[PDB]
């Protein structure tokens, strides 16, 4: 009758959590890249491919936080800077009275601080939070440039990958293939605008947890690169102050302006039209506001570039109801929305101009206003098509057999 027969050699699998490598081409726990990655396509295969309950993202975020903190503990702790700071406003040039020349009685030195790193007190003024925050500075050797970092599976784990360019986040896609070493992933911190990343080719792609809910974010990679030509027009000067020598700003070179950005108005308006074409898929008008409030890091497009921390509100853009942005920078910063720890971002001399990409966008319904504020969502776009899988060659099935 219906009797069981074991069938060793089965090609089944059951996805599971695991630790992965940190393979790059150039951040010390890295290993070099594999020579000839093999992408073995699978024919006539389908499986419930999810991307929001993924187990690699939470791994990747844990890695970045560690990689961030590992290369930051040994530095000149800014604890000595906890003392009343004498300061005065700067009127050498105004073309914007934010900067403030601050003098300090020191084991008497002067420096320039932005308004966002000085707090109102009760005249003479003090830094934002040092008596109640263990500030730290960054070594000049390290560079905040985004280095590509691959994730490869260890022995026994086969990383699948979805291929259907029409991929609505979750749900099956019968185009999967074993991609043991993954494609280039760039860990870049950005809000409201995924700078560098992939882009749907056919058309704007809309993916989210569950669209009908207005809590879950909207993650979109639309079609094609829009650039963001944005600069820092200030020849600033760095001059060492030995306390173990934290960097500061002694003065600047002549003219002063604001870090204007350029967005190529025509291209940006063109892209949103395709975007709103898809947004209407699931007649009522769709209007992009520019977020609501809560934190520069979130409210604005707080994007690192050129070794400096930009905080630039998209109020300029996202003003449409159907360029040039005054992008101020802040010296102190608490990355990862943390409580307590905060960095210092030592200054860099001269000017810096940089432009790469606006490949992705983060939107929050009410589609309307943008705000991401959670760098876990950023990496859920690049890892949208990878789920580590453990092969299980055993198998069991009933059969009309009787053994003995």
């Amino acid at each position: 009758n219906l009797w069981v027969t074991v069938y060793y050699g089965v090609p089944v699998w059951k996805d599971a959590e695991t630790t992965l490598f940190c393979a790059s081409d150039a951040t010390h726990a890295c290993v070099p890249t594999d020579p000839n990655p093999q992408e073995i396509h699978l024919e006539n295969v389908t499986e419930e491919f999810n991307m929001w309950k993924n187990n690699m993202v939470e791994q990747m975020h844990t890695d970045i936080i560690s990689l961030w903190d590992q290369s930051l503990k040994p530095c000149v702790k800014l604890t000595p800077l906890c003392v009343t700071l004498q300061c005065t406003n700067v009127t050498n040039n105004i073309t914007r009275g934010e900067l403030k020349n601050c003098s300090f009685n020191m084991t008497k030195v002067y420096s320039l601080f932005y308004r966002l790193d000085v707090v109102q007190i009760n005249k003479e003024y003090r830094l934002i939070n040092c008596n109640t925050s263990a500030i730290t500075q960054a070594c000049p050797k390290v560079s905040f440039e985004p280095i590509p970092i691959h994730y490869c599976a260890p022995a026994g784990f086969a990383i699948l990958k979805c291929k259907d360019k029409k991929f609505n986040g979750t749900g099956p896609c019968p185009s999967v293939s074993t991609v043991q070493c993954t494609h280039g992933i760039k860990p870049v911190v950005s809000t409201q605008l995924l700078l560098n990343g992939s882009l749907a080719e056919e058309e704007v792609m809309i993916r989210s947890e569950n669209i009908t809910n207005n809590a879950k974010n909207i993650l979109v990679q639309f079609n094609t690169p829009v650039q963001i030509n944005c600069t820092r027009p200030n020849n600033n000067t760095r001059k060492s102050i030995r306390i173990q020598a934290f960097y500061a700003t002694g003065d600047i070179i002549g003219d002063i302006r604001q870090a204007h950005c350029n967005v190529s108005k025509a291209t940006w308006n063109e892209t949103l039209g395709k975007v709103v074409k898809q947004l209407r898929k699931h007649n009522t008008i769709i209007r992009f506001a520019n977020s609501s409030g809560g934190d520069l890091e979130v409210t604005t497009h707080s994007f690192n570039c050129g070794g400096e921390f930009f905080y630039c509100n998209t109020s300029g853009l996202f003003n449409s109801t159907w360029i040039t942005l005054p992008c101020r920078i802040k010296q102190i910063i608490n990355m990862w929305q943390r409580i307590g720890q905060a960095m210092y971002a030592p200054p860099i001399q001269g000017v810096i101009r940089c432009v790469s990409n606006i490949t992705g966008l983060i939107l929050t319904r009410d589609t309307f206003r943008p705000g991401g504020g959670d760098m876990r969502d950023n990496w859920r776009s690049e890892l949208y098509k990878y789920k580590v899988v453990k092969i299980e060659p055993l198998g069991v099935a009933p059969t009309r057999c009787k053994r003995r």
Partner: T-cell receptor
Amino acid sequence: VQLVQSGAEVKKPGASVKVSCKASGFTFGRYSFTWVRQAPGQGLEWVGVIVPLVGVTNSAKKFQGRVTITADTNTVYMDLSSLRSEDTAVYYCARVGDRFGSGYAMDVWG
Amino acid sequence: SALTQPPSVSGAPGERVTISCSGSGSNFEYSFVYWYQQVPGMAPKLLIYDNYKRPSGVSDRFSGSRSGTSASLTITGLQTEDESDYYCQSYDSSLTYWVFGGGTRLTV
């Protein structure tokens, strides 16, 4: 996981109160703890915050130096000095932020 | 900072109640606002963090909203269970101080 908390007490004006919160099921790791209190029939009013990782403390600044919050490795201790009639309240403690240290929304409550 | 709530807002079951979160300060444009529910006599629980999100084990009926300097907590499908107090707070990241709202009592 839960925040087991000390029992009720009866103190005098200007006496010393020291309440406890023991991390049941988890270590300090990167979380931060805050202390809030509620006058009976009144809304919550903040009291303090500690970050066990880096020893950072704070207060509501209308407890001017009266309150100190300590972390021992397992539990957290906050002490009151110079009590007055307005300081009678239920003193909750809560965990701030998930793993990774992110967030500021205190959600697990004793 | 400081922020003030209406002291009590009431409504019949099945309605769409909106409890305002005023008191907006100059810095309140920054400083995310959360939302807390407490059953009177019980430990307050969390409802909304970072102005719109919702934790896993919280009913989908609640929802968040930010409007200019003010905030609002939106409820649909009101039931008899909603008889409790709702407090809204904001994390002033400058001076590192949570400040709580006065207290709103939702009465059926």
